[PDB]
Scaffold this motif. Structure first.
Motif, PDB file in Angstrom:
ATOM      1  N   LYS A  13       0.925  -1.132   0.000  1.00  0.00           N
ATOM      2  CA  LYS A  13       0.000   0.000   0.000  1.00  0.00           C
ATOM      3  C   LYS A  13       0.974   1.192   0.000  1.00  0.00           C
ATOM      4  O   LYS A  13       2.125   1.036   0.406  1.00  0.00           O
ATOM      5  N   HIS A  14       0.583   2.371  -0.449  1.00  0.00           N
ATOM      6  CA  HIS A  14       1.570   3.443  -0.433  1.00  0.00           C
ATOM      7  C   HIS A  14       0.956   4.732   0.049  1.00  0.00           C
ATOM      8  O   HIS A  14       0.436   5.501  -0.745  1.00  0.00           O
ATOM      9  N   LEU A  15       1.056   4.963   1.358  1.00  0.00           N
ATOM     10  CA  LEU A  15       0.481   6.135   2.033  1.00  0.00           C
ATOM     11  C   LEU A  15       1.298   7.406   1.996  1.00  0.00           C
ATOM     12  O   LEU A  15       2.511   7.371   2.094  1.00  0.00           O
ATOM     13  N   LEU A  16       0.617   8.540   1.914  1.00  0.00           N
ATOM     14  CA  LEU A  16       1.296   9.827   1.875  1.00  0.00           C
ATOM     15  C   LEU A  16       1.343  10.418   3.280  1.00  0.00           C
ATOM     16  O   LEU A  16       0.500  10.092   4.115  1.00  0.00           O
ATOM     17  N   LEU A  17       2.315  11.298   3.521  1.00  0.00           N
ATOM     18  CA  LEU A  17       2.502  11.938   4.818  1.00  0.00           C
ATOM     19  C   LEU A  17       2.736  13.454   4.623  1.00  0.00           C
ATOM     20  O   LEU A  17       3.798  13.890   4.165  1.00  0.00           O
ATOM     21  N   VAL A  18       1.730  14.260   4.935  1.00  0.00           N
ATOM     22  CA  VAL A  18       1.847  15.714   4.767  1.00  0.00           C
ATOM     23  C   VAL A  18       1.607  16.566   6.067  1.00  0.00           C
ATOM     24  O   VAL A  18       0.764  16.249   6.933  1.00  0.00           O
ATOM     25  N   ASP A  19       2.433  17.599   6.225  1.00  0.00           N
ATOM     26  CA  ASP A  19       2.375  18.504   7.367  1.00  0.00           C
ATOM     27  C   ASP A  19       1.068  19.277   7.366  1.00  0.00           C
ATOM     28  O   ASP A  19       0.891  20.220   6.604  1.00  0.00           O
ATOM     29  N   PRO A  20       0.132  18.894   8.229  1.00  0.00           N
ATOM     30  CA  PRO A  20      -1.155  19.583   8.292  1.00  0.00           C
ATOM     31  C   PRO A  20      -0.918  21.014   8.730  1.00  0.00           C
ATOM     32  O   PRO A  20      -1.584  21.939   8.267  1.00  0.00           O
TER      33      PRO A  20
END
Length: 104
Positions: A52-59
């Protein structure tokens, strides 16, 4: 250096296909930085024999999910890992169980 870029499970700019060739058992995870054309970070893991390939972004300078905002990638990992809550995205859920540590 003095942060995310030190973490045993963080492999720097690892390519997508390679990353999938490092997962052996479900729950296998490792983080790398955007590869097609570099920007943010991705969580790659195995579940059911398919990555699976999840994204990680600074809210807000942190790093968020489908229901939470953290301080960084490091904070995101322990919340799920230590605590054992599966990241659920689109009805699908990825269990962080064993970091695929960098070889050293």
């Amino acid at each position: 250096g003095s942060q995310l870029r030190g973490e045993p499970w963080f492999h720097g700019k690892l390519s997508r296909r390679e990353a999938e060739a490092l997962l052996q058992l479900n729950g296998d995870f490792l983080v790398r930085e955007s590869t097609t054309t570099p920007g943010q970070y991705v969580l790659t893991g195995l579940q059911s024999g398919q990555p699976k390939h999840l994204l990680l972004v600074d809210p807000e300078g942190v790093v968020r999910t489908k229901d939470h905002r953290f301080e960084s990638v490091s904070h995101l990992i322990s919340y799920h890992m230590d605590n054992h809550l599966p990241i659920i995205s689109a009805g699908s859920e990825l269990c962080l169980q064993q970091p695929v540590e960098r070889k050293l």
